[PDB]
Structure 1
Amino acid sequence: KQDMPPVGGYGPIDYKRNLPRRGLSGYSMFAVGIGALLFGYWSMMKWNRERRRLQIEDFEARIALMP
């Protein structure tokens, strides 16, 4: 008279299938990308242009000597 099945206490667990979490898609991407990339080239032309100014100063000390 000592046998298994309980009178109660059950679930069940699902048979389902779901993890579609979105996700920042669909014109949200391709907009943060271009907005990041244009910040890069804007951070250029303030350094590459400025290094071009110090470049001429480096040639300047050459030319003021050599006679």
Structure 2
Amino acid sequence: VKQDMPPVGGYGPIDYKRNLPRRGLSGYSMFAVGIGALLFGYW
């Protein structure tokens, strides 16, 4: 018979977890960049 069935090997894996990338610098480096920009502007 011919029916709509999944393939014999099964379908591939499907991701479902939450994925936030965790990008970017730390707080210390961000604050250091801010004070560096301030010091350059003041000079």
TM > 0.5 fold call: yes
Q: Which runs of 5+ in 2 are unaligned?
A: none
SS of alignment partner, residue 11 of structure 2: coil
Distance 1:33 1:5 in 2: 56
Distance 1:8 1:26 in 2: 48
Structure 1 residue 20 displacement after superposition: 3.2
Q: Scaled by the length of structure 1, what TM-score is found?
A: 0.48
Structure 1 residue 9 displacement after superposition: 4.3
Q: Scaled by the length of structure 2, what TM-score is found?
A: 0.65
Structure 1 residue 22 displacement after superposition: 3.0
Q: Which has the higher helix share?
A: 1
Measured against aligned partners, the alpha-carbon deviations of 1:31-58 in whole angstroms (never above 9, x if no partner) come to 10010111011xxxxxxxxxxxxxxxxx
Change (3 A) 1:6 1:34: same
RMSD over aligned CA atoms reads: 1.9
Distance 1:3 1:20 in 2: 38
